Amino acid sequence: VNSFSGYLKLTDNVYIKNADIVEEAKKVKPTVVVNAANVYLKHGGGVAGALNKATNNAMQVESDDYIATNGPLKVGGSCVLSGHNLAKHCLHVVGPNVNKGEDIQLLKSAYENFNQHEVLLAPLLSAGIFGADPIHSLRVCVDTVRTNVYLAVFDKNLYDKLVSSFL
Numbered sequence: 001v002n003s004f005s006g007y008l009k010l011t012d013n014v015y016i017k018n019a020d021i022v023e024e025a026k027k028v029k030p031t032v033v034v035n036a037a038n039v040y041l042k043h044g045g046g047v048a049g050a051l052n053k054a055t056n057n058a059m060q061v062e063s064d065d066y067i068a069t070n071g072p073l074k075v076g077g078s079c080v081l082s083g084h085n086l087a088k089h090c091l092h093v094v095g096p097n098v099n100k101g102e103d104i105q106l107l108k109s110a111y112e113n114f115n116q117h118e119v120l121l122a123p124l125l126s127a128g129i130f131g132a133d134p135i136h137s138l139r140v141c142v143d144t145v146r147t148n149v150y151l152a153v154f155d156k157n158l159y160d161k162l163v164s165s166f167l
């Protein structure tokens, strides 16, 4: 038993809700919140900009030190950093950005990072400003993640289309 509430169950291990991931993180304090990161951990907009704003820019300060030490992530890769006031940990995961021409096949590699964590609150990778089809992203998630994932979908209209079209 865990503290996630109001989710629709899609499969044995994947759940979904119309929610603002920032507000969900603020209430649940999950062990892991996933950020929709880029390779530079520049949290300017989308999910990343919203998560970072909610930390009063502490996420960005920590991220800049991480990059200065380690260099950029790989597309499809991830790193574990602090969850600040939102979660114990933040798993920064880089899905391919279609608006940069990155290979959508890397989306599966991106979701594989979730399997290193027993339970996660997450957005749909490569959705939103990353330019991928969220229905495809959900399919890859279901077919790749084996750990327990709670997906927060900000847009109510999108949430209804994902549910109604789910196979």
Ligand SMILES: O=C(O)CC[C@H]1CCCN(c2ncnc3[nH]ccc23)C1
Residues within 6 Å of the ligand: 019, 020, 021, 022, 036, 045, 046, 047, 048, 050, 123, 124, 127, 128, 129, 130, 134, 152, 153, 154, 155, 158
């Ligand atoms: O319609 C969706 O979910 C997909 C849109 C992407 C794009 C970036 C922001 N998107 C979010 N997803 C969940 N929570 C959020 N809070 C603030 C933004 C946010 C995900």
